[PDB]
Amino acid sequence: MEVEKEFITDEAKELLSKDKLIQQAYNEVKTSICSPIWPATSKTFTINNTEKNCNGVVPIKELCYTLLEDTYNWYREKPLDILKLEKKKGGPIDVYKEFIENSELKRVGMEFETGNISSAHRSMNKLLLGLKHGEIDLAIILMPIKQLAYYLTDRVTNFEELEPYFELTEGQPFIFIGFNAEAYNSNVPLIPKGSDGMSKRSIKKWKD
Amino acid sequence: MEVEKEFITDEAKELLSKDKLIQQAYNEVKTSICSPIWPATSKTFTINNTEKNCNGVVPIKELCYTLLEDTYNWYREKPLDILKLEKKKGGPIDVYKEFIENSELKRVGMEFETGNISSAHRSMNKLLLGLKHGEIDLAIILMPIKQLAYYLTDRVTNFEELEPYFELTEGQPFIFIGFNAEAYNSNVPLIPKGSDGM
DNA sequence: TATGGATCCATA
DNA sequence: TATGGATCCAT
């Protein structure tokens, strides 16, 4: 997979230039998102382009999550205190990791959005909320770009469609990454939808 | 239909206290939202409570829009300049109306959310964007409360689920209103569904 | 009566 | 075209 579009707030740029732990986080994220391939035996991600919305989204994230969790030690389902404890309503964050080096600690929250575009607004607000309540120091949202999404389940989150709203995270450190396949072709197999595209891996939950 | 819950940012409270144009927009929407009845012969909104999520959501909004549009003169699908003109990306706002009186104009935008709860965040954000850009002066969101939603299509916007995010509108004039059915009864007809997604 | 999602719809 | 929406799913 390749990263083709990115939006970095000014606040995230400042941390990205001076801060080594943030620098480290970003690198683990980029490398993880560039890792997905299709098919499994290939060295790049090629997507079937026979027709509009022909592919399901589930399997596309697998290799990204595996790398973060198993090679980089990020956790899944970290709940925010403002939600679990105070409001007692609202689910957790997709991915999370604490980066420590001597006295320094940096907490990063991230959501890899492949749901409907409307869900991304939710992920965005949810990260907004943990940033404003001091629970995370940087927020990251990963999603496909529009070109890629043309061949995915209809209406999934795409960079270009969320882009007019990026402006609502100003004043906070946030990074938006739009990924695209490295090739389009109808020789490759279709990513399955439904149960068949379902992940069957055990996930590294924060509660462990 | 009844209005059962409401959250008014302190900024909207001020306006609702001082502004007549604002009070008028408010009473209009309230009257309209209290509009829906079921069945069509009834004087109130009765909802078939046979099973969880047994009713569809479309025909619920009908009578509310009708009053807004036909009686009160609000306009549907009003595009925002930041999106249609500047960013050149994005859809319009659901209901809009200009309150003009003397040298005064009050611009109100409103979203009647019956889509997935996730959508509600899109609506909230789009209305925050119009507020931030000075295109509207008050933003309002109407949604079912959880009790009523329980009988509607699974996962539709419900007051209580959006509630933890109200604070994201802080500093802005906003109004969230949650409506409920006047009664529940298994003898009234089911609100039909469509064939969306799955 | 919990909650993030995954999928397809209809009208431009 | 592009966009808001509706409908069930999985844990």
Count how many Cα atoms sit within 13 Å of the Cα of residue A111 in the half-sphere of its side chain: 25
- The structure tokens 């990074």 sit at A175
- The structure tokens 């960079």 sit at A159
Q: Tokens in use for B37?
A: 């009845």
CB neighbours of residue B198 within 10 Å:
4
Distance between CA atoms of residues A57 and A153, nearest Å: 7
Distance between CA atoms of residues A147 and A152, nearest Å: 9
Fold type of domain B1-198: Restriction Endonuclease (3.40.91)
Distance between CA atoms of residues A126 and A132, nearest Å: 10
Distances (CA, A) of A3 to A34, B32, B42, B125: 7, 48, 57, 26
Query: Residue A70's Cα: distance from chain center in Å?
Result: 16
Label residues A13-44 b or e (16+ Cβ within 10 Å = b): eebbeebebbebbbebbbebbbbbbbeeeeee
Q: Is the CB of A123 under 7 A from strand C?
A: yes
Distance between CA atoms of residues B176 and B124, nearest Å: 10
Distance between CA atoms of residues B74 and B98, nearest Å: 8
- A145 part of contact set with chain B, CB < 8 Å: no
- A122 part of contact set with chain B, CB < 8 Å: yes
- Long-range Cβ pairs for the range A205-208 (8 Å, 24+): A205/A75, A205/A76, A205/A77, A206/A75, A206/A76, A206/A77, A206/A78, A206/A79, A206/A92, A206/A96, A207/A77, A208/A75
- The structure tokens 């409570």 sit at B49
HEC string of chain B equals CEEEEEEECHHHHHHHHHCHHHHHHHHHHHHHHCCCCECCCCCCEEECCCCCCCECCHHHHHHHHHHHHHHCCCEEEECCHHHHHHCCCCCCEEEEEEEEECCEEEEEEEEECCCEHHHHHHHHHHHHHHHHCCCCCEEEEEEECHHHHCCECCCECCHHHHHHHHHHHCCCCEEEEEEECCEECCCCCCCCCCCCCC
List, in sequence order, every residue forming a beta bridge with B109; answer none if it has no partner. B96, B139
Rounded to whole angstroms, the maximal C-alpha distance in chain A is: 53
Distances (CA, A) of B127 to A43, B58, B130: 44, 22, 5
- The structure tokens 């859809």 sit at B91
A89 three-class SS: coil
Listed by the residue before each break, gaps in chain A with C–N over 2.5 Å are: none
Distance between CA atoms of residues B194 and B147, nearest Å: 22
Q: Tokens in use for B186?
A: 């298994």
CB proximity list for B159: less than 8 A, separation 6 or greater: B5, B143, B144, B145, B146, B176, B178
Query: Do the Cβ atoms of A122 and B125 come within 8 Å?
Result: no
DSSP conformation class of A141? E
DSSP conformation class of A67? I
- B145 part of contact set with chain A, CB < 8 Å: no
Interface of B with A in 29-68 (CB under 8 A): none
Distances (CA, A) of A140 to A25, A106, A131, A197: 10, 14, 11, 25
Instruction: Count Cβ atoms within 10 A of the Cβ of residue A185 and give its class: 0-12 exposed, 13-18 middle, 19 or more buried.
Output: exposed
CB distance B130 to B103 below 8 Å: no
Distance between CA atoms of residues B118 and B165, nearest Å: 12
* Resolution number, Å: 2.2
Start-end of H helices in chain A:
10-18, 20-33, 58-66, 81, 117-132, 146-149, 159-162
Query: Do the Cβ atoms of A119 and B118 come within 8 Å?
Result: yes
Distance between CA atoms of residues A50 and A27, nearest Å: 34
Distance between CA atoms of residues B93 and B110, nearest Å: 7
Cis status, amide bond into A39, omega within 30 of 0? yes
**AA identity, residue A6:** E
- The structure tokens 């980029």 sit at A30
Question: A10-18 and A20-33 helices cross at what angle (nearest 10)?
Answer: 110
Please pick, among A113, A135, A163, A182, the residue that the annotation labels catalytic. Answer: A113
DSSP conformation class of A45? B
Distance between CA atoms of residues B114 and B176, nearest Å: 13
- A163 part of contact set with chain B, CB < 8 Å: yes
Distance between CA atoms of residues A14 and B112, nearest Å: 40
Label residues A48-60 b or e (16+ Cβ within 10 Å = b): bbeeeebbbbbbb
Distance between CA atoms of residues A182 and B187, nearest Å: 58
- Long-range Cβ pairs for the range A193-197 (8 Å, 24+): A193/A55, A193/A56, A193/A58, A193/A153, A194/A56, A196/A56, A197/A56, A197/A57, A197/A58, A197/A59
Query: Do the Cβ atoms of A119 and B115 come within 8 Å?
Result: no
CB neighbours of residue A170 within 10 Å:
11
Listed residue (A15, A29, A11) closest to A177, CA to CA: A29
Distance between CA atoms of residues B156 and B115, nearest Å: 5
Q: Which residue is nearest to nucleotide C3 (CA to C1')?
A: A91
A185 three-class SS: strand
Q: Which residue is nearest to nucleotide D5 (CA to C1')?
A: B115
CA distance B83 to chain A (A): 7
Q: Is the CB of A146 under 7 A from strand C?
A: no
CB neighbours of residue B101 within 10 Å:
10
Pairing outcome for strands B104-112 and A46-48: unpaired
Query: Do the Cβ atoms of B122 and A125 come within 8 Å?
Result: no
Distance between CA atoms of residues A76 and A94, nearest Å: 5
Distance between CA atoms of residues A26 and A137, nearest Å: 13
A/B interface, count of CB pairs below 8 Å: 59
Q: Tokens in use for A62?
A: 């697998």
DSSP conformation class of A145? -
Q: Which residue is nearest to nucleotide D9 (CA to C1')?
A: B198
Q: Is the CB of B51 under 7 A from strand D?
A: no
- The structure tokens 């575009």 sit at A117
What's domain A1-208's architecture?
A: 3-Layer(aba) Sandwich (3.40)
Radius of gyration in angstroms for the set of CA atoms belonging to chain B, rounded to a whole number: 17
